[PDB]
Write a protein that binds this ligand. Structure first.
Ligand SMILES: O=C(O)[C@H]1O[C@@H](O[C@H]2[C@H](O)[C@@H](NS(=O)(=O)O)[C@@H](O[C@H]3[C@H](O)[C@@H](O)[C@H](O[C@H]4[C@H](O)[C@@H](NS(=O)(=O)O)[C@@H](O[C@H]5[C@H](O)[C@@H](O)[C@H](O[C@H]6[C@H](O)[C@@H](NS(=O)(=O)O)[C@@H](O[C@H]7[C@H](O)[C@@H](O)[C@H](O)O[C@@H]7C(=O)O)O[C@@H]6CO)O[C@@H]5C(=O)O)O[C@@H]4CO)O[C@@H]3C(=O)O)O[C@@H]2CO)[C@H](O)[C@@H](O)[C@@H]1O
Ligand SMILES: O=C(O)[C@H]1O[C@@H](O[C@H]2[C@H](O)[C@@H](NS(=O)(=O)O)[C@@H](O[C@H]3[C@H](O)[C@@H](O)[C@H](O[C@H]4[C@H](O)[C@@H](NS(=O)(=O)O)[C@@H](O[C@H]5[C@H](O)[C@@H](O)[C@H](O[C@H]6[C@H](O)[C@@H](NS(=O)(=O)O)[C@@H](O[C@H]7[C@H](O)[C@@H](O)[C@H](O)O[C@@H]7C(=O)O)O[C@@H]6CO)O[C@@H]5C(=O)O)O[C@@H]4CO)O[C@@H]3C(=O)O)O[C@@H]2CO)[C@H](O)[C@@H](O)[C@@H]1O
Ligand SMILES: *[C@@H]1O[C@H](CO)[C@@H](O[C@@H]2O[C@H](CO)[C@@H](O[C@@H]3O[C@H](CO[C@H]4O[C@H](CO)[C@@H](O)[C@H](O)[C@@H]4O)[C@@H](O)[C@H](O[C@H]4O[C@H](CO)[C@@H](O)[C@H](O)[C@@H]4O[C@@H]4O[C@H](CO)[C@@H](O)[C@H](O)[C@H]4NC(C)=O)[C@@H]3O)[C@H](O)[C@H]2NC(C)=O)[C@H](O)[C@H]1NC(C)=O
Ligand SMILES: *[C@@H]1O[C@H](CO)[C@@H](O[C@@H]2O[C@H](CO)[C@@H](O[C@@H]3O[C@H](CO[C@H]4O[C@H](CO)[C@@H](O)[C@H](O)[C@@H]4O[C@@H]4O[C@H](CO)[C@@H](O)[C@H](O)[C@H]4NC(C)=O)[C@@H](O)[C@H](O)[C@@H]3O)[C@H](O)[C@H]2NC(C)=O)[C@H](O)[C@H]1NC(C)=O
Ligand SMILES: *[C@@H]1O[C@H](CO)[C@@H](O[C@@H]2O[C@H](CO)[C@@H](O[C@@H]3O[C@H](CO[C@H]4O[C@H](CO)[C@@H](O)[C@H](O)[C@@H]4O)[C@@H](O)[C@H](O[C@H]4O[C@H](CO)[C@@H](O)[C@H](O)[C@@H]4O)[C@@H]3O)[C@H](O)[C@H]2NC(C)=O)[C@H](O)[C@H]1NC(C)=O
Ligand SMILES: *[C@@H]1O[C@H](CO)[C@@H](O[C@@H]2O[C@H](CO)[C@@H](O[C@@H]3O[C@H](CO[C@H]4O[C@H](CO)[C@@H](O)[C@H](O)[C@@H]4O)[C@@H](O)[C@H](O[C@H]4O[C@H](CO)[C@@H](O)[C@H](O)[C@@H]4O)[C@@H]3O)[C@H](O)[C@H]2NC(C)=O)[C@H](O)[C@H]1NC(C)=O
Ligand SMILES: *[C@@H]1O[C@H](CO)[C@@H](O[C@@H]2O[C@H](CO)[C@@H](O)[C@H](O)[C@H]2NC(C)=O)[C@H](O)[C@H]1NC(C)=O
Ligand SMILES: *[C@@H]1O[C@H](CO)[C@@H](O)[C@H](O)[C@H]1NC(C)=O
Ligand SMILES: [Ca+2]
Ligand SMILES: [Ca+2]
Lengths: 516, 512
């Protein structure tokens, strides 16, 4: 019985080269992979090779506990927003990501900002507490080389009381055409730098980094202007704004280095493998005050509050976060001009704001969340987010298009937001959220089957709205769909959610609905 | 060819044995076939072996002409209704198939009867004319008759039929009178018959089952079918007035030998290889004894006549069996109507009218639109999708089911009628067709999975998994849309035909 080449005719159209042993035919995975759109590779173990086949990529989140508004946000403990190449950088002034997804010019995308917040919130609950190293308090610390300041000629420093802040602070005076005053740091493990800052004049706070790229030094300059980001090797510049009143500056030096070096005029940051291996020293220029200089493994809550604060300050009078970029969802849909709202933005923002409220009891956050339900009440053409499927089912549009698009995953995020709010706001204040949630959940249960292909899910209902082919959801949207339904199945006991979760999971392993 | 056997882990769940050459891994088709639900086999040609892979089974009809109401019915020239194992037999009395699909007791299913008619109509237009061999006219045509003692035969005039006929008298406790036939090529027997008493006309067949003789008895009672040893019995009814009896001896033999108490006929390989002789018992008359390759028009008119005689006062063909479409749908009690039955019946009746100009057929067709006007709950066939789109239900369930293929057959019927009845008489059909076609265009995308079609909308109506259409229903869907695309110029039909065809070859809608 010979093992030999055999011609394999595919659908009477093309011949590939297979192999035959007796009656058994073997087909090349090169063909299988492309023809069925599946995944595989040879994995090398110690003394053992194994081919490993997968129907899909992407994994379902292993939910540990029922969903609650003050817990982790779905699967976002595993999200890494800032490494996404559509994140140009973390704004120095705002402390939140700028997106370039639909425009190289860059814009604050509320969805991305909410996800930044919610992922950092979730990581705060799941990760080990950070190591925190304190380099300067200007107190009676009063050892451990906290006074390793270099003060060149023409510069001055002092420990001085700040009555307003009930603490001692480090005063510094250093002209910009000088070396500046310099604090030796030397951290090789942790790369989140933090310091309380108040400038009297223009100036900068700079951090020198040893990197993994051939031992070479890069400096990151945090400058008292509004310029976003600049890179002229080996110097990276972020404007952090005037900082003429006390604030805590928190920066991730890994992200700030990678986004600097990777700076691009395109919609995508250049890939780089560069990492900082040592935080060498901090340089202060101009006239001002410093306190509480620290380096931490992580600073999740600072990120979360930067997102929350941004959402409060940037909400408009209609309760919305307008998206200031043109969105063309596809042929047959009208272009959305800048200033459109997204049900996904509203929902993700509400989930952020509700968590901010529950932590602080600061009603400013809750009130912003309550205002954010207003766009759910108005049709897309009335500058809202509401669509109605076949004059029967209310829907909250990720993309408020004409005709309506009915994107599934944005809708479910819009509902989770409403849930967080209605559970938190109390009976009287939460009435509108409760009503929108109940109507929305009724729609979801009725319409879920329209998104099921029998071997996957559809992203939206454009096939029906425009009379074209289904827009099939790629596997990472399919797992998003599962993660969302899995979450909803813990706050609503409807059997339909559990049955759909189970079937949609089976699709990841190549199961199919039965044919007749 | 050198290789290495290599373990192939499938979805982290089970391991199969593959083969590796360099970076290339080859997977066993044994696995591919089952895992992806695909088809393949090694075909041996002279000096060339080739593995031949198919994503699907089932082929799209190669349309040769735009659709017309008096032409072939879609792809039905290729249909073979009578070999289907859910056809218990061709009724002796009625000359149409009896179904056992949803009950072993058997029932006349109007859809199956219409398809019998429409397939034979279509074959009539596409096949070569049959060879017809005439054995007895009782004229001055040319005896091959054996008349045992105690039997009698004569040539006698029949004034009513303007012909001479063969009189026969033969007691049942005798061999009967026998005409030698001897046909080895053709197996459709035909004869004009009139009994004076009870009796039988029997046909002896030489068969492929160890050269054995089997006899098929056409008996003057209403008993459906019986099989004992090498004798098969069909009741053909009293036959006390002249009628033409036409029987397919291949089918009649296979259904006899395959006789079962289940919903499916037993498979058999048995075939007749010779029509030996015809035996007459009792008192009666015979004329025009013939054997033909085919008799398509006799089959077509048996179906048409049955439809005329069995239509009720509401214009419907009631289906006299319980239908349970699935969990979530109320059972349909016997007497329900089907939009597919109404449509297929209309398509049959319209063709019968255009051949004969007999207005009885057109009148029956016109009456058959009435159930399309009434909701399922009012004992009609109409459903309304989301208070917007009229639909004609193959299965008029509660809740509504929206079976695609039945709906399209219901529309083709309305089309046949509106085109044939003229402007005034065809008004109701035209209105129902136009509304229906609007619905079809709007709702087609709901049946598209991106790699196939769904059979119905039960997933949405009941909140469950999609009921995916088998490949043979998917090709039915394509054949129907292809037909509609030749009588309606809407781009949507051409676009859907094209995409749905691509699915047969493993193409998929793009993911985002
Ligand atoms: O350690 C490791 O192994 C590595 O980890 C890597 O990160 C992992 C991470 O650990 C994983 N987390 S875990 O699974 O939980 O453990 C995992 O996280 C992913 C996750 O799988 C994704 O589901 C998730 O998606 C997010 C989006 O990131 C987010 N975007 S953002 O704006 O906030 O930045 C948001 O997406 C919605 C937004 O509205 C839009 O961005 C998005 O646009 C769609 C568009 O709607 C589509 N339109 S279409 O009409 O259907 O076509 C479509 O459009 C594009 C077409 O696809 C193209 O053909 C066309 O040319 O261009 C079109 C276009 O861009 O316009 O697609 C786009 C883009 O998706 O719509 C979104 C919507 O909701 O509809 O919210 C999503 C859902 O939550 O991102 C997670 C994440 O990155 O955190 O996987 C990642 C890896 O991928 C590390 O990166 C690595 O360093 C480690 O080594
Ligand atoms: O050439 C040779 O060598 C061989 O040829 C062989 O025949 C070929 C033939 O040449 C082909 N023709 S060609 O393509 O033109 O070249 C081809 O003909 C087929 C064709 O592919 C089919 O599309 C066609 O389907 C017909 C039906 O036969 C017909 N039925 S009948 O009543 O008239 O007898 C009619 O079907 C509708 C009826 O209302 C019902 O019968 C039917 O019931 C469905 C039911 O609705 C489904 N329900 S579900 O809730 O969705 O599941 C489903 O139900 C069954 C489930 O599948 C099972 O799981 C369960 O256990 O049992 C369920 C049940 O039975 O209840 O399926 C059933 C059955 O389909 O609904 C129909 C509807 O319209 O919805 O109309 C159909 C479409 O026109 O049949 C053609 C034919 O046979 O003529 O293919 C054959 C290959 O077989 C010879 O056979 C061979 O001898 C030669 O050697
Ligand atoms: C599809 O369906 C069509 C339509 O049915 C079919 O065409 C018909 O084919 C049949 C074949 O049997 C033809 O029937 C014959 O009709 C003869 C008289 O018909 C006249 O009128 C029609 C129009 O109405 C004219 O077009 C036609 O040209 C004629 O002028 C009739 O004489 C025949 O009767 C003889 O044969 C039968 C058995 O078939 C027998 O029982 C009779 O006793 C009679 O005896 C024999 O006569 C023939 C002479 O025809 C003679 O050769 C023979 O020797 C005699 N036998 C003996 C022993 O002496 C018969 O009824 C019909 O005309 C066709 N119609 C049309 C419109 O073409 C197609 O063939 C079908 N195709 C397929 C693929 O299924
Ligand atoms: C998820 O988020 C929660 C809530 O935010 C975190 O828990 C909180 O952790 C923080 C610790 O960062 C804790 O904060 C208090 O901070 C006070 C600040 O005072 C001192 O620490 C800072 C540096 O962190 C310095 O800048 C100050 O100058 C103070 O320095 C002290 O004095 C000497 C110098 O002379 C210094 O060497 C000492 O190390 C330092 N002393 C101490 C005790 O740090 C503290 O006064 C106070 O004790 C807290 O540390 C806050 O209380 C936590 N809240 C809760 C509810 O637990 C989680 O860590 C976070 N988890 C994850 C995984 O992200
Ligand atoms: C560097 O990091 C340290 C943290 O380690 C910061 O020092 C803390 O600063 C905060 C405020 O800036 C101080 O908290 C304030 O306490 C005031 C009263 O403090 C007295 O009483 C306490 C004991 O109860 C004594 O320990 C203390 O010495 C004082 O005698 C309050 O009046 C302040 O709150 C007021 O306003 C809020 C509303 O916003 C109300 O909630 C209050 O009721 C009140 O009206 C405030 O809470 C804290 O004492 C400092 N800690 C230490 C250990 O010194 C530095 O500020 C930081 N550096 C910079 C520049 O920010
Ligand atoms: C075996 O097969 C043969 C066919 O080969 C059948 O014989 C035919 O039978 C039919 C019907 O019985 C005969 O058709 C009838 O012919 C009548 C007159 O025939 C001739 O005679 C007149 C003159 O007297 C001529 O003018 C005429 O042109 C004919 O040449 C017609 O009067 C009949 O008319 C029909 O229509 C009118 C209404 O429009 C009715 O009133 C009548 O009742 C009838 O329906 C009719 O056309 C045909 O002539 C026979 N052909 C031959 C060659 O004999 C046998 O009947 C069949 N055997 C059996 C048992 O059925
Ligand atoms: C930092 O420098 C800018 C100039 O680049 C200063 O901005 C000016 O401020 C004065 C008020 O004192 C205004 O009248 C000018 O119009 C501003 N000019 C520009 C170009 O913005 C800024 O004041 C400096 N910062 C501090 C703390 O003094
Ligand atoms: C007619 O039926 C009777 C019994 O009902 C039977 O005795 C007789 O054999 C039958 N006659 C013929 C000719 O078959
Ligand atoms: Ca201090
Ligand atoms: Ca005669």
């Amino acid at each position: 019985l010979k093992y030999e080449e055999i011609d394999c005719l595919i659908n009477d159209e093309h011949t590939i080269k297979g192999r035959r042993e007796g009656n058994e035919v073997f087909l090349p995975f090169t063909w299988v992979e492309k023809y069925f759109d599946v995944y595989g590779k040879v994995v090398q173990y110690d003394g053992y090779d194994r081919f490993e086949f997968s129907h899909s990529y992407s994994k379902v989140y292993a939910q540990r506990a029922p969903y609650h508004p003050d817990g982790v946000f779905m699967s976002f403990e595993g999200y890494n927003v800032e490494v996404r190449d559509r994140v140009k950088c973390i704004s120095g002034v705002e402390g939140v990501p700028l997106s370039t997804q639909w425009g190289p010019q860059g814009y604050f995308y509320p969805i991305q900002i909410a996800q930044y917040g919610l992922s950092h919130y979730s990581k705060n609950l799941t990760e080990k507490p950070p190591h925190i190293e304190v380099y300067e308090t200007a107190e009676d610390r009063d050892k451990n080389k906290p006074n390793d300041w270099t003060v060149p000629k023409g510069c001055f420093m002092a420990n001085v009381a700040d009555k307003s802040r009930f603490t001692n602070v480090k005063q510094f005076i250093a002209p910009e055409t000088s070396e500046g005053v310099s604090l030796q740091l030397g951290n090789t493990k942790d790369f989140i730098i933090s310091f309380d800052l108040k400038f009297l004049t223009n100036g900068s706070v700079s951090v020198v980094l040893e990197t993994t790229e051939k031992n070479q030094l890069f400096t990151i300059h945090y400058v008292s202007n509004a310029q976003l980001i600049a890179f002229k090797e080996r110097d990276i510049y972020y404007g952090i704004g005037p900082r003429t009143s006390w604030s805590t500056v928190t920066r991730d030096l890994v992200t700030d280095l990678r986004k600097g070096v990777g700076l691009s005029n395109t919609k995508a940051v250049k890939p780089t493998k560069i990492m900082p291996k040592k935080v060498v020293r901090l340089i202060a220029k101009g006239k001002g005050f410093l306190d509480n200089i620290t380096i931490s493994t992580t600073a999740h809550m600072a990120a979360f509050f930067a997102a929350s604060d941004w959402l409060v300050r940037n909400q408009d009078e209609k309760g919305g976060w307008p998206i200031m970029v043109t969105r063309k969802l596809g042929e047959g849909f009208k272009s959305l001009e800048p200033g459109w709202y997204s049900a996904m933005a509203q929902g993700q923002a509400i989930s952020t704001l509700v968590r901010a409220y529950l932590l602080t009891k600061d009603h400013i956050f809750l009130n912003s969340a309550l205002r954010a339900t207003a766009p759910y009440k108005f049709l897309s053409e009335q500058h809202g987010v509401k669509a109605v499927f076949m004059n029967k089912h209310d829907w909250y549009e990720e993309y408020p298009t004409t005709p309506s698009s009915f994107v599934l995953n944005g809708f479910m995020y819009s509902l989770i937001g409403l849930y967080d709010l209605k559970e938190t706001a109390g009976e009287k204040l939460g009435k509108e959220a409760r009503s929108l949630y109940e109507r929305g959940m009724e729609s979801l249960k009725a319409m879920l089957p329209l998104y099921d292909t029998g071997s996957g899910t559809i992203y939206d209902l454009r096939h029906f709205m425009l009379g074209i082919a289904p827009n099939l959801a790629r596997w990472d949207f399919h797992t998003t769909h599962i993660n969302q339904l899995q979450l909803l199945s813990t706050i609503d006991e409807s059997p339909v959610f559990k049955e759909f979760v189970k079937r949609w999971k089976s699709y990841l392993k190549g199961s199919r609905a039965k044919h007749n």
